From a paper:
[name] (MOKV), as other lyssaviruses—including rabies virus (RABV)—causes deadly encephalitis in mammals. Its envelope [name] G is involved in two successive steps of virus entry: receptor recognition, to allow virion endocytosis, and fusion of viral and endosomal membranes, to release the viral nucleocapsid into the cytoplasm for the subsequent steps of infection. Fusion is triggered by a low pH-driven conformational change of G from its pre-fusion toward its post-fusion conformation. G is also the target of neutralizing antibodies.
The second one corresponds to a construct in which the hydrophobic fusion loops 74FVGY77 and 121WL122 have been replaced by more hydrophilic sequences 74GNGS77 and 121GS122 (G1-436*). We screened several crystallization conditions for MOKV G1-436*, obtained crystals at pH 7.5 and determined the structure of the protein at 2.9 Å resolution by single-wavelength anomalous dispersion (SAD). The chain was traced from residues 1 to 109 and 118 to 401. Although the crystal structure is not trimeric, the overall structure is very similar to the protomer of the trimeric post-fusion state of CHAV and VSV G. In particular, the lateral helix is already formed and the conserved residues D143, Y145, and H397 that lock the hairpin-shaped post-fusion conformation are at the same place as in VSV G post-fusion protomer. However, the long helix, which constitutes the center of the post-fusion trimer for all class III fusion glycoproteins, is bent in MOKV G, which is not the case for vesiculoviruses G. This indicates that the trimerization motif of MOKV G is a coiled-coil, whereas it is a trimeric bundle of straight helices for vesiculovirus glycoproteins. Inside a protomer, D275 faces H384 (located in the lateral helix of R5), making an interaction that stabilizes the post-fusion state. E269 faces D211 (located in the PHD), and the deprotonation of their side chain at high pH induces a repulsive force that may contribute to the structural transition back to the pre-fusion state. Finally, residue H261 that is positively charged at low pH is sandwiched between the acidic residues D266 and E45.
Author numbering: 1 to 109, 118 to 401
Amino acid sequence: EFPLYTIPEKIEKWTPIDMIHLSCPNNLLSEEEGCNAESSFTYFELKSGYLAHQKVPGFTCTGVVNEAETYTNGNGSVTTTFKRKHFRPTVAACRDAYNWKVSGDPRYEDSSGSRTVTTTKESLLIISPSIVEMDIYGRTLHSPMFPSGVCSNVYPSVPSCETNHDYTLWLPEDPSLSLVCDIFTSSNGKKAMNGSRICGFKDERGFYRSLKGACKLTLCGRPGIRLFDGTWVSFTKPDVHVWCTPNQLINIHNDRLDEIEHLIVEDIIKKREECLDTLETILMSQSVSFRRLSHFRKLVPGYGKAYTILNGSLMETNVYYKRVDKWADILPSKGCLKVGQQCMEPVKGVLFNGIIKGPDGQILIPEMQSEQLKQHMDLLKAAVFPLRHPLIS
Ligand SMILES: *[C@@H]1O[C@H](CO)[C@@H](O)[C@H](O)[C@H]1NC(C)=O
Ligand SMILES: [Tb+3]
Ligand SMILES: [Tb+3]
Ligand SMILES: [Tb+3]
Ligand SMILES: [Tb+3]
Ligand SMILES: [Tb+3]
Ligand SMILES: [Tb+3]
């Protein structure tokens, strides 16, 4: 991921240069892993947002029978006594009843004598839609009408789950369970490589993730891998070799993640626009103003250049760029900028990369006062809900 800030490991030489040697950095996260090569490829991730096929459409099926004894009371009365009781359905009956219902027909649906009793016994099955949930980590099928919370059968062969009422069974709408793990999209990403080695990818939004520390995880039949940050994707030759502890969970794929991801990626773009735009006005106004060198800082860790102005001239040195995690790790004192081991003595109020000592003695870094990439980086961290197992226990 992107750091908050970057800072030279050490600063030694400070050689001079002309404004036409100003380079804007390309900020490739994958470079710090040693992979500067980006070839397209295609990977599987969860569908975005709602997963209509983690839910399983089905129907309860209860068997009733209504008896009606129509006796003549001997008063000359004609009296009718009703009894209602239950019975247990067979799966094949329930299916035929359901199919009968989905298309209109005749669905659901007495002589006196003087001295005869008459008993009509009607044997209905009632069919109400009932949705039940599935654990995509491993195909079991949970609901609170099932007696242990878990279906009595198990994917791919569920003729019927057993419910808590001996007279009611649950059948699934599609006895095949053929749609019931279509929860995947195929997206197009850009894989970052070094010859053969695969170090990470940018997903369909442009957001880079590293493969380092990624365990293997099979989700609802498809064997993918779990990326450190928690998200899950499957593609052909992962080079991942450590199965996950079942403790581990993946994350959902909600839309605002994908949205906020895209915000991050246009943020990286806009700093690279703003660096060329600055470097243009630098060469076409032929006036370089120290405030603005801030734009040439290598946003990613790695090797690069650093820039200042002294003795009137403009000048550079070649550095390794440490990741900076907390502002306080480089600003321990007021007025102190921790480069390597000592503070950085500013000459007539300037240090490198546009960092100055303001008139109050404080070390002003422009990125520190407002950075839209950093504010967005936090929202992403906050849109990440882990996809948990079913709660029914
Ligand atoms: C691959 O890694 C080697 C070793 O550091 C490096 O010399 C080479 O430039 C790399 N190739 C890339 C990043 O395409
Ligand atoms: Tb080093
Ligand atoms: Tb009787
Ligand atoms: Tb929104
Ligand atoms: Tb929106
Ligand atoms: Tb331009
Ligand atoms: Tb301080």
